[PDB]
Design an enzyme around this catalytic site. Structure first.
Site, mmCIF file in Angstrom:
data_model
loop_
_atom_site.group_PDB
_atom_site.id
_atom_site.type_symbol
_atom_site.label_atom_id
_atom_site.label_comp_id
_atom_site.label_asym_id
_atom_site.label_seq_id
_atom_site.Cartn_x
_atom_site.Cartn_y
_atom_site.Cartn_z
ATOM 1 N N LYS A 1 0.787 -1.226 0.000
ATOM 2 C CA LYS A 1 0.000 0.000 0.000
ATOM 3 C C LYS A 1 0.821 1.280 0.000
ATOM 4 O O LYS A 1 0.274 2.360 -0.221
ATOM 5 C CB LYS A 1 -0.994 -0.004 1.162
ATOM 6 C CG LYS A 1 -1.935 -1.206 1.163
ATOM 7 C CD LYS A 1 -2.753 -1.276 -0.120
ATOM 8 C CE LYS A 1 -3.727 -2.439 -0.087
ATOM 9 N NZ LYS A 1 -4.648 -2.406 -1.258
ATOM 10 N N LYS B 1 1.644 5.210 -5.036
ATOM 11 C CA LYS B 1 2.216 3.912 -5.395
ATOM 12 C C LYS B 1 2.958 3.990 -6.719
ATOM 13 O O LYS B 1 4.080 3.495 -6.846
ATOM 14 C CB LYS B 1 1.120 2.848 -5.503
ATOM 15 C CG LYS B 1 0.368 2.598 -4.222
ATOM 16 C CD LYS B 1 -0.911 1.819 -4.478
ATOM 17 C CE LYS B 1 -1.786 1.818 -3.235
ATOM 18 N NZ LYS B 1 -3.065 1.094 -3.444
ATOM 19 N N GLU C 1 -5.790 -1.895 -10.841
ATOM 20 C CA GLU C 1 -6.815 -1.781 -11.871
ATOM 21 C C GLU C 1 -7.392 -0.371 -11.737
ATOM 22 O O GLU C 1 -8.085 0.113 -12.629
ATOM 23 C CB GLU C 1 -7.924 -2.818 -11.677
ATOM 24 C CG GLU C 1 -7.747 -4.108 -12.489
ATOM 25 C CD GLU C 1 -8.888 -5.102 -12.301
ATOM 26 O OE1 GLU C 1 -9.855 -4.797 -11.573
ATOM 27 O OE2 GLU C 1 -8.813 -6.208 -12.873
HETATM 28 C C1 LIG Z 1 -6.441 -7.277 -11.180
HETATM 29 C C2 LIG Z 1 -6.154 -6.600 -9.838
HETATM 30 C C3 LIG Z 1 -6.263 -5.272 -9.624
HETATM 31 C C4 LIG Z 1 -5.975 -4.645 -8.354
HETATM 32 N N1 LIG Z 1 -6.071 -3.298 -8.219
HETATM 33 C C5 LIG Z 1 -5.753 -2.768 -7.059
HETATM 34 C C6 LIG Z 1 -5.801 -1.325 -6.892
HETATM 35 O O1 LIG Z 1 -6.142 -0.541 -7.786
HETATM 36 N N2 LIG Z 1 -5.434 -0.869 -5.686
HETATM 37 C C7 LIG Z 1 -5.020 -1.683 -4.598
HETATM 38 O O2 LIG Z 1 -4.714 -1.113 -3.580
HETATM 39 N N3 LIG Z 1 -4.982 -3.042 -4.752
HETATM 40 C C8 LIG Z 1 -5.315 -3.581 -5.897
HETATM 41 N N4 LIG Z 1 -5.271 -4.946 -6.086
HETATM 42 C C9 LIG Z 1 -4.842 -5.914 -5.051
HETATM 43 C C10 LIG Z 1 -5.990 -6.747 -4.446
HETATM 44 O O3 LIG Z 1 -6.868 -5.964 -3.634
HETATM 45 C C11 LIG Z 1 -5.369 -7.836 -3.558
HETATM 46 O O4 LIG Z 1 -4.698 -8.757 -4.452
HETATM 47 C C12 LIG Z 1 -6.310 -8.644 -2.685
HETATM 48 O O5 LIG Z 1 -7.034 -7.842 -1.730
HETATM 49 C C13 LIG Z 1 -5.624 -9.811 -1.993
HETATM 50 O O6 LIG Z 1 -4.583 -9.278 -1.194
HETATM 51 P P1 LIG Z 1 -3.082 -9.693 -1.431
HETATM 52 O O7 LIG Z 1 -2.715 -9.359 -2.851
HETATM 53 O O8 LIG Z 1 -2.263 -8.968 -0.403
HETATM 54 O O9 LIG Z 1 -3.061 -11.247 -1.201
HETATM 55 C C14 LIG Z 1 -5.572 -5.519 -7.312
HETATM 56 C C15 LIG Z 1 -5.473 -6.882 -7.554
HETATM 57 C C16 LIG Z 1 -5.742 -7.456 -8.759
HETATM 58 C C17 LIG Z 1 -5.609 -8.932 -8.970
HETATM 59 N N1 LIG Z 2 -8.389 0.055 0.447
HETATM 60 C C1 LIG Z 2 -7.529 -0.853 -0.066
HETATM 61 O O1 LIG Z 2 -6.498 -1.154 0.523
HETATM 62 C C2 LIG Z 2 -7.824 -1.516 -1.402
HETATM 63 C C3 LIG Z 2 -8.317 -0.713 -2.449
HETATM 64 C C4 LIG Z 2 -8.524 -1.229 -3.743
HETATM 65 N N2 LIG Z 2 -8.936 -0.350 -4.795
HETATM 66 C C5 LIG Z 2 -9.347 1.045 -4.477
HETATM 67 C C6 LIG Z 2 -8.054 0.773 -5.216
HETATM 68 C C7 LIG Z 2 -8.320 -2.613 -3.982
HETATM 69 N N3 LIG Z 2 -8.578 -3.189 -5.196
HETATM 70 O O2 LIG Z 2 -9.067 -2.511 -6.075
HETATM 71 O O3 LIG Z 2 -8.326 -4.365 -5.325
HETATM 72 C C8 LIG Z 2 -7.832 -3.412 -2.925
HETATM 73 C C9 LIG Z 2 -7.604 -2.904 -1.634
HETATM 74 N N4 LIG Z 2 -7.186 -3.773 -0.643
HETATM 75 O O4 LIG Z 2 -7.850 -3.855 0.381
HETATM 76 O O5 LIG Z 2 -6.194 -4.458 -0.864
#
Ligand SMILES: Cc1cc2nc3c(=O)[nH]c(=O)nc-3n(C[C@H](O)[C@H](O)[C@H](O)COP(=O)(O)O)c2cc1C
Ligand SMILES: NC(=O)c1cc(N2CC2)c([N+](=O)[O-])cc1[N+](=O)[O-]
Ligand SMILES: Cc1cc2nc3c(=O)[nH]c(=O)nc-3n(C[C@H](O)[C@H](O)[C@H](O)COP(=O)(O)O)c2cc1C
Ligand SMILES: NC(=O)c1cc(N2CC2)c([N+](=O)[O-])cc1[N+](=O)[O-]
EC number: 1.-.-.-
Lengths: 217, 216
Positions: free
Chosen positions: A14, A74, A165
């Site tokens: 993050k 990021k 994404e």
């Molecule tokens: C296709 C894709 C897009 C994602 N986009 C974001 C994003 O825009 N911001 C973010 O903070 N995490 C993003 N993530 C991470 C996911 O939230 C994360 O993989 C999920 O919550 C599982 O946590 P981990 O990767 O720590 O195991 C994305 C993951 C994937 C697979």
């Molecule tokens: N608040 C977060 O930390 C967050 C935000 C996003 N999006 C807003 C960018 C995604 N995600 O899209 O997978 C995943 C997480 N996560 O919990 O890992």
């Protein structure tokens, strides 16, 4: 250590520590990871933008606007940022390029074997191009597979990353002029090392139980 | 070293039906499928792991048409995993995910839980309502899982081959995942290749970086 340990311990970072850069060798290794990912019929319907300079990342970061300001830090703080792109259409000149590369790499003992490979690739290519009309989605699928391979791989190198994404694809596409080049941006992946500000580094990983997502037969 | 495995792995064309996965490897395969990341941790998937000869034969039926040449991979392999994607993202699934994260202690307060659920609902709504691509969006997460899986098994010292050459309609009817709300996307036989595998000695081929990669 085994990849299971890596899989169970990797996480979406993050916040990145902008002072911790990839080592010169690591910079080459992530490129190798990008190129060698498998894809249907080895079509490799992709293009990668690897930003490592402050200027380069700033151009990528333009996509983290509007409702995506959440991902700007990021994109700017990580050592290297990879933009995964997919071809907008599967053209025959590219299909030819792929068969010729396999041929040059020595994968066909006879000129008949090579001809058989072009045909096999032509079967699937046309199935999506002419019949299903989903070649854009088919190629995007291969790119996402590449992202999956890439995420586990960089974690295996002891590198932190986060799949994104949440970015404006139209903005990113226009910045690097991808439309005219025949590509579209799908996923942005900052890679480097997390900072103390990365609250996700210490939180437990969460996943649905196998009794719900997995059936054994 | 993971670069060594990425460079040495390959798609095996034929498996030695005598080489079965150890109970540890069989467990590890499921761990890999479960822990793959996904957009918003939505985990829009279902996996069918066929280890018995009967289970594998059922999967192999999806290749009786124009894909006869893919049946042997599905039968000779120790374990065969069919990656399935949800056909529609429902509020019931959305709640299962956020409640599971809550159970796993990812939220310090009920507000964060609410904010996490809202953030996921945002992305989920956009795909079904505005972009009209929720099916493909979820299918893309499944493909991401496949990429993670292929590298993972190669790193475990196992051979595998991702298969798109199968009849999804036939496979779907066999396991009734249609009514369950899922669709078959990729079949991945895992095991050990036989001395017959021609791809094992074959040099790997990929386009050069000067074509596919731009540095800025
Ligand atoms: C296709 C894709 C897009 C994602 N986009 C974001 C994003 O825009 N911001 C973010 O903070 N995490 C993003 N993530 C991470 C996911 O939230 C994360 O993989 C999920 O919550 C599982 O946590 P981990 O990767 O720590 O195991 C994305 C993951 C994937 C697979
Ligand atoms: N608040 C977060 O930390 C967050 C935000 C996003 N999006 C807003 C960018 C995604 N995600 O899209 O997978 C995943 C997480 N996560 O919990 O890992
Ligand atoms: C989505 C997908 C579907 C595939 N389907 C098949 C298939 O039906 N039959 C097959 O023999 N190989 C199949 N493959 C394997 C690819 O042809 C292979 O990954 C590619 O030619 C690169 O070779 P490598 O895997 O040895 O690096 C598939 C691969 C992917 C990613
Ligand atoms: N490039 C390949 O490995 C390949 C080759 C064939 N032909 C040789 C049998 C077929 N196919 O015809 O279905 C399918 C694929 N495929 O990966 O999708």
């Amino acid at each position: 250590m085994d990849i299971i340990s890596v899989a169970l311990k990797r996480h979406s970072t993050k916040a990145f520590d902008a002072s911790k850069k990839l080592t010169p060798e690591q910079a080459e290794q992530i490129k190798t990871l990008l190129q060698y990912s498998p894809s249907s019929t080895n079509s490799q319907p992709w293009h990668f933008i690897v930003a490592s300079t402050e200027e380069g990342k700033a151009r990528v970061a333009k996509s983290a606007a509007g409702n995506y300001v959440f991902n700007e830090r990021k994109m700017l703080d990580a050592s290297h940022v990879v933009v995964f792109c997919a071809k907008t259409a599967m053209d025959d000149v590219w299909l030819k390029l792929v068969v010729d590369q396999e041929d040059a790499d020595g994968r066909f003992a006879t000129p008949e074997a090579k001809a058989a490979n072009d045909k096999g690739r032509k079967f699937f290519a046309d199935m999506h191009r002419k019949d299903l009309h989903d070649d854009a989605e088919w190629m995007a699928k291969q790119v996402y597979l590449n992202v999956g391979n890439f995420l586990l791989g960089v974690a295996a190198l002891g590198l932190d990353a986060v799949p994104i994404e949440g970015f404006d694809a139209a903005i990113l596409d226009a910045e690097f002029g991808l439309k005219e080049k025949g590509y579209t941006s799908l996923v942005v992946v900052p890679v480097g090392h997390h900072s103390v500000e990365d609250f996700n580094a210490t939180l437990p990983k969460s996943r649905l139980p196998q009794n719900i997502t997995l059936t054994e037969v």
